[PDB]
Design a protein around this ligand. Structure first.
Ligand code: SF4
Ligand code: SF4
Ligand code: SF4
Ligand code: SF4
Ligand code: FES
Ligand SMILES: [Mg+2]
Ligand SMILES: [Mg+2]
Length: 580
């Protein structure tokens, strides 16, 4: 093909869109509703408008290049059209960046500045409450910011195939929201927050727990524990202009102390706990030749997916609590026993890459003796905001260490945040347990990486077993609906709702679409975790010295007795009833 763009001739055999071709050749074309290889097919934003001679104005993001095209991306006519569209969006946008939670990384603001757009009539609603939906334990909607770009609807469809995020007709006007404008939690929504990650503006957010946290920190009698997820140490640096793939574990520990938390632990310790219990359960099911398969239960997006779409599998889920909840349980029982704290005064906070974890923490039965396992969950984004509000110079902080009693972790625990991480970690322990051995080959590279569905055959005690790693909620649907689950007997299956695993969770830093083209965010974030695993002396959960002490002195034998009583949680399908 011969293509002319802004007077420059290109000869190409590529079959692609004007936008992609332009961007591959460093020609600037703006875009808004285009993301994840799709745009908003109904009511296109047209921010990607270009001019094609003999055709007129076209949308670059969904128009294929053709031999003979002569394209202008920067004519007066083009720029006036784009400016007009942005002005029209400003007419439905509460343009008050000052207090806005996307102030520092908003795509819309950048477009407004670029084209110097202005509303025809400022959008200034007085009763914001009718634009806001805060009913969910996990998600919140602020429709005064919504551009109706459809990126959330498209991302939900692509990432989960639930289509829980929909366009709705609300009293004659178009909004996005859940089915029948219900609270997301009361629908088939997984609360995974991929819709948030896709949002260019501050219209979708996590349900804030920041006041729970501040209130607890300032309560004189509360002893506030904080523990961060595997993925936080691989990602939060992004929001402090430190770049991608930077391990900031030590800086986080320092920042948390400077924020006034009373104890600095780590959810990776909880991950090693989950493996103790789950590997023990796996070895049990083997020795009892069933039931199979066993599914992981540490992803609450997946648990909701099972609850909402596959209730028949709930009995197959591992009974071990997730690292967050298992940690939380121990923080109200074991931790008082080694500290003297009154359990009622312990307030346990996690920092997560995840919105669905907020729902998990607030499940009514996730408590014992009136004490919540977990009292608050803040996302990576929320912690970043707390750090900046406190004027803590994150990038400049010295490294400190976690408090060890519930802060040590093995390399198995460290890799939980990547797809296949739980699987690999679990196998390292299950194989040692089953064979009564200390095996040296512990790297299961077959279950790593970004393939949607990953399988491996593993040898445990001279019998062969089949494992699968399901990488993304859409791939769970593919795995089940396609009958893949019946090609062979699976014994142990990992499921993560977010593709890439938790490093790509719904509570993570937003990444602007251009950076996403430059950087494989899923692999770069995961690389930090695998690097930790490689350089840790202990690489099996059951070699965690603090964990071993905890079990020896407090819980006893994993998978039975006190451990089973306290550290496990079973989900139940509803009993048959009519009408349904
Ligand atoms: S969403 Fe963006 S443009 Fe709108 S108020 Fe917030 S920062 Fe400003
Ligand atoms: S939280 Fe996940 S399942 Fe629910 S609407 Fe958003 S993307 Fe869809
Ligand atoms: S909530 Fe965000 S992604 Fe969804 S339509 Fe509104 S602005 Fe677009
Ligand atoms: S994959 Fe991780 S971040 Fe995503 S829903 Fe599951 S637990 Fe949350
Ligand atoms: S970016 Fe092309 S129509 Fe929206
Ligand atoms: Mg399209
Ligand atoms: Mg305090």
């Amino acid at each position: 093909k011969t293509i002319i763009i802004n007077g420059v001739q290109f000869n190409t055999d590529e079959d692609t869109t004007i936008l992609k071709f332009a961007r591959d050749n460093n020609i600037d074309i703006s875009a808004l509703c285009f993301l994840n290889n799709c745009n908003n097919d109904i009511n296109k934003c047209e921010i990607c408008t270009v001019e094609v001679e003999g055709t007129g104005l076209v949308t670059a993001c969904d128009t294929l290049i053709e031999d003979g095209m002569i394209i202008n991306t920067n004519s007066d006519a083009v720029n006036e059209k784009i400016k007009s569209r942005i002005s029209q969006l400003l007419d439905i946008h509460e343009f008050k960046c000052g207090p806005c939670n996307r102030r520092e990384n908003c795509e819309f603001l950048k477009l407004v500045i670029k084209y110097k757009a202005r509303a025809s009539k400022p959008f200034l609603p007085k009763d914001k409450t009718e634009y806001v939906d805060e009913r969910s334990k996990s998600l919140t909607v602020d429709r005064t910011k919504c551009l109706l770009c459809g990126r959330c609807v498209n991302a939900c469809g692509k990432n989960t195939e639930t289509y829980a995020m929909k366009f709705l007709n609300k009293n004659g006007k178009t909004i996005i929201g859940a089915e029948d404008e219900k609270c997301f939690d009361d629908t088939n929504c997984l609360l995974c927050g991929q819709c948030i990650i896709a949002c260019p503006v501050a219209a979708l957010s996590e349900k804030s727990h920041m006041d729970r946290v501040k209130n607890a920190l300032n309560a004189p009698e509360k002893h506030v524990i904080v523990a961060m997820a595997p993925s936080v140490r691989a990602s939060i640096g992004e929001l402090f202009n430190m770049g991608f793939g930077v391990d900031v574990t030590g800086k986080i520990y320092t920042a948390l102390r400077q924020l006034g938390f009373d104890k600095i632990f780590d959810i990776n310790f909880g991950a090693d706990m989950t493996i103790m219990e789950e590997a023990t359960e796996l070895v049990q099911r083997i020795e009892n030749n069933g039931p199979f398969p066993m599914f992981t239960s540490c992803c609450p997006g997946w648990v909701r997916q099972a609850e909402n779409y596959y209730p028949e599998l709930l009995n197959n889920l591992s009974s071990a609590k997730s690292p967050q909840q298992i940690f939380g349980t121990a923080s109200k029982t074991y931790y008082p026993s080694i500290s003297g704290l009154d359990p009622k005064n312990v307030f346990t906070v996690t920092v997560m890459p995840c919105t669905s974890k907020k729902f998990e923490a607030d499940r009514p039965q996730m408590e014992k003796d009136g004490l919540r396992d977990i009292d608050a969950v803040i996302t990576t984004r929320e912690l970043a905001k707390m750090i900046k509000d406190a004027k803590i110079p994150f990038a400049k902080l010295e490294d400190s260490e976690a408090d060890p009693a519930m802060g040590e972790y093995s390399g198995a625990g460290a890799i939980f945040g990547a797809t296949g991480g739980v699987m690999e970690a679990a196998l390292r322990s299950a194989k040692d347990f089953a064979e009564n051995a200390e095996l040296e080959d512990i790297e299961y590279k077959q279950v790593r990486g970004l393939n949607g569905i990953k399988e491996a055959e593993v040898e445990i005690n001279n019998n062969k077993y089949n494992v699968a790693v399901i990488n993304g909620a859409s791939n769970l649907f593919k795995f089940m609906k396609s009958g893949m689950i019946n090609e062979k007997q699976y014994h142990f299956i990992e499921v993560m709702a977010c593709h890439g695993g938790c490093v790509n969770g719904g509570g993570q830093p937003h990444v602007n679409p251009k950076d996403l083209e430059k950087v494989d965010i899923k692999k770069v974030r995961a690389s930090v975790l695998y690097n930790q695993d490689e350089h840790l002396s202990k690489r099996k959960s059951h070699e965690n010295t603090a964990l071993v002490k905890m079990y020896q002195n407090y819980f006893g034998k994993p998978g039975e007795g006190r451990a089973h009583e306290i550290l496990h949680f079973k989900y139940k399908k509803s009993a048959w009833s009519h009408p349904q």
